[PDB]
Design a protein around this nucleic acid. Structure first.
Ligand SMILES: [Zn+2]
Length: 19
DNA sequence: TACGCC
């Protein structure tokens, strides 16, 4: 629960995008 | 911000 690729409550994919 | 992708 958090990011998509990172693993932290920083943001979601539209704010990450980080592959 | 960058693949929402590996
Ligand atoms: Zn992330």
């Amino acid at each position: 629960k958090g990011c998509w690729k990172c693993g932290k409550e920083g943001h979601q994919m539209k704010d990450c995008t980080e592959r």
